[PDB]
Amino acid sequence: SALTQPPSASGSPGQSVTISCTGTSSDVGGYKYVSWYQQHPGKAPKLMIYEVSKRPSGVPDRFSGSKSGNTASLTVSGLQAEDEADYYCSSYEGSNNFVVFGGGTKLTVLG
Amino acid sequence: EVFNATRFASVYAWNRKRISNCVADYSVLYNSASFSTFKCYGVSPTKLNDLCFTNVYADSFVIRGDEVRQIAPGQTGKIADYNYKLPDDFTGCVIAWNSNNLDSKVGGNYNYLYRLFRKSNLKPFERDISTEIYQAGSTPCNGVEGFNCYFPLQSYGFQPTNGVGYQPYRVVVLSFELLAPATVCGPKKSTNLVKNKCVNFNFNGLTGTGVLTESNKKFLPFQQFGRDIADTTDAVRDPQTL
Amino acid sequence: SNIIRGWIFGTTLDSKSLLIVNNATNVVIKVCEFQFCNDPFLGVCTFEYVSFKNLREFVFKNIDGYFKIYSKHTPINLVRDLPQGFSALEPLVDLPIGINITRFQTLLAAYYVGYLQPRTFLLKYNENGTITDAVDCALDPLSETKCTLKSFTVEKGIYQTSNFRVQPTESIVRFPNITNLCPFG
Amino acid sequence: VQLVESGGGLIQPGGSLRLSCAASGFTVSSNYMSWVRQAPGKGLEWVSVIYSGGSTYYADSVKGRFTISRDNSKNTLYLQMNSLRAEDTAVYYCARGEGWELPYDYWGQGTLVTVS
Ligand SMILES: *[C@@H]1O[C@H](CO)[C@@H](O[C@@H]2O[C@H](CO)[C@@H](O)[C@H](O)[C@H]2NC(C)=O)[C@H](O)[C@H]1NC(C)=O
Ligand SMILES: *[C@@H]1O[C@H](CO)[C@@H](O[C@@H]2O[C@H](CO)[C@@H](O)[C@H](O)[C@H]2NC(C)=O)[C@H](O)[C@H]1NC(C)=O
Ligand SMILES: *[C@@H]1O[C@H](CO)[C@@H](O)[C@H](O)[C@H]1NC(C)=O
Ligand SMILES: *[C@@H]1O[C@H](CO)[C@@H](O)[C@H](O)[C@H]1NC(C)=O
Ligand SMILES: *[C@@H]1O[C@H](CO)[C@@H](O)[C@H](O)[C@H]1NC(C)=O
């Protein structure tokens, strides 16, 4: 129902890491719009990739993972020392305007 | 014409059609099974053919699946708030059905625009088509569509693989107005004709009991009854075979 | 030359009605709140419809929202005016429009224009059901007699027809001279 | 888009907090807005929305009790609550946006609100 994911996905700095975002086909295989989220500890909830083919105005490029049917996945390329944070997901239910979110993906980049 | 139309109208230009001097057999489409729901409001699905309204209004627009549930009397929801605001005393039957087999198309069907955002909800049945770009912030946009400035409409792009919540459900909602004589009424049955038996007849207007025999009285092309020297019915023109 | 064609009805006749065009090919109607010119003429909408030597009579009466249009296209060879004679009018159409009509017009000979009144006629149906004569039962004493008898030939004698009274002319109203408003407060 | 929340605290069952997110940078009238909160160590929890036509929605635990309102102009923006239990401790943040479409991009500064 909720965009539950494996809360910890790691990888080497510079290489890529897949951060998934999994829910039911009632929504994730229904709409055109899914939005991704990430939060540096204490930072306000920062969206990452809404309208998966789109991003916000000035947010950098190594973001933009995709949605593989029933399950989404964020593909961060070129892992740099500033790519350590907590990640989240967000989209819409199929009832009463309900907007859904992710279970909390703490992106644990190896130090 | 309205239901089986080839060219449906978008929801930001949601339609309306006054239909008069009609005989409207609601049941011949109620028993169609091509509908997702016949959700009458004010009256019953059946028991319409015995109604005589002044006019009926056939809206012809398409929405998504959950927007069907949005369409209902006095609702709170994007379409019921910015595209087609039913009054709470709406007398009719929303008749929606999927068209993911019919209107959907590969790559999407980008011909539909729904009223994305606007300052306030509509009056009942208010047909808002004005494309005044959204004003917000503190300045008019003057076409550039800056911050807080947006288009009042949003394209659908119906993808044939979208879920039931995003599949095209061509909806057509009818309303009933009563002001004036009623020009729209459901059909009326007409049984077989029995002669030489004391029956309880009912010709189109008049009733009574008697024994109908084939006569040789030659009415005038427009007459309908006959009468006796004391003004009692004496002949009736058979309204199917004259 | 088939000149007088149309009609126009309503209560304002300017953007706030009926119409019966006959534009040379196809009878038309409408109830659309038309804007016809102040000088309507034919050169050389909860409703719709499509499709001297002659005297195209008519009758229009709109009672209880129904606008009934009797008619008869009886012919003549006359050049002066209304030919004396009798010809009943057979209901042609019936429209369930329901306007208020207190004015009309014409479009394009002669066209006389009566005005109905709540009369009481004595129609004489013949063997076929076709009216052949009538007796205006308020026209003259002979007609009031023919009416009270219900016959078209009145035998010699003396018949009682109506009850005649004098109508009151003035309206005398006398009341005690009081000006003080009544203490209802 | 300078939006500054204010009004958090700690409340025993019965009280009511009325947040006040200034709307200096962006009109809340003839516009849209959403309210959210996040439990420490959890994804977000949508708690309220306010459409342009005054439409409102809340999630499961907050519908029927949470009551969002705001003045006619872009002065303030509220989030009133009722019947508080020990379950509702979560740091608050304001989210410029409305629903999935028109995503949440602009945000507030964050008021620490704790309910127990
Ligand atoms: C009413 O409908 C009936 C339907 O049968 C018509 O009856 C037919 O009249 C035609 C005249 O050529 C004949 O073939 C038969 O007498 C009838 N049956 C069929 C199968 O045609 C009738 O004419 C209609 N009348 C009106 C006034 O509508
Ligand atoms: C009643 O109408 C009939 C016609 O339906 C009239 O009789 C016909 O009159 C015409 C004269 O134009 C003759 O050519 C026919 O031979 C007549 N046929 C019959 C069967 O009568 C009749 O005259 C009318 N009734 C009256 C009292 O005149
Ligand atoms: C006559 O009136 C009808 C009514 O709509 C119209 O359609 C038609 O074009 C007009 N002219 C002719 C020549 O029929
Ligand atoms: C017609 O007159 C009646 C008289 O009361 C009035 O109620 C009605 O509104 C009028 N309708 C029109 C169209 O003038
Ligand atoms: C009594 O009060 C009513 C309402 O204030 C007023 O209309 C009326 O004039 C008063 N009575 C007198 C005698 O003035």
Residue numbers in the entry:
A (entry chain L): 2 to 9, 11 to 27, 27A, 27B, 27C, 28 to 95, 95A, 95B, ...
B (entry chain C): 340 to 518, 520 to 582
C (entry chain A): 98 to 113, 116 to 143, 166 to 172, 186 to 242, 263 to 339
D (entry chain H): 2 to 82, 82A, 82B, 82C, 83 to 100, 100A, 100B, 101 to 112
The authors write:
Coronavirus S proteins contain three copies of an S1 subunit comprising the S1A through S1D domains, which mediates attachment to target cells, and three copies of an S2 subunit, which contains the fusion peptide and functions in membrane fusion. We found another type of ACE2 receptor-blocking anti-SARS-CoV-2 antibody in our analysis of a neutralizing mAb derived from the COV107 individual. The shared binding mode of C105 and B38, both VH3-53-derived mAbs, defines a recurrent class of anti-SARS-CoV-2 mAbs.
To improve features at the SARS-CoV-2 RBD-C105 Fab interface, particles from states 1 and 2 were combined and used for non-uniform, focused refinement to yield a state 1-like reconstruction to an FSC = 0.143 resolution of 3.4 Å. The C105-RBD interfaces were similar across the five examples in the state 1 and state 2 complex structures, thus we describe the interface for one of the Fab-RBD complexes in the state 1 complex in which the resolution at the interface was improved by performing a focused, local refinement (Punjani et al., 2017) on the C105 Fab-RBD portion of the complex. The common epitope of C105 and B38 overlaps with the binding site for ACE2, rationalizing their potent neutralizing activities (Robbiani et al., 2020; Wu et al., 2020c). In cryo-EM structures of the prefusion S trimer (Walls et al., 2020; Wrapp et al., 2020) and in our C105-S complex, S protein residue D614 is located in S1D, where it makes contact with an adjacent protomer. The RBD-binding COV21 Fab(s) and the C105 Fab are distant from residue D614. Indeed, in the absence of large conformational changes, all anti-RBD antibodies, including C105 and B38 (Wu et al., 2020c), would be unaffected by this substitution.
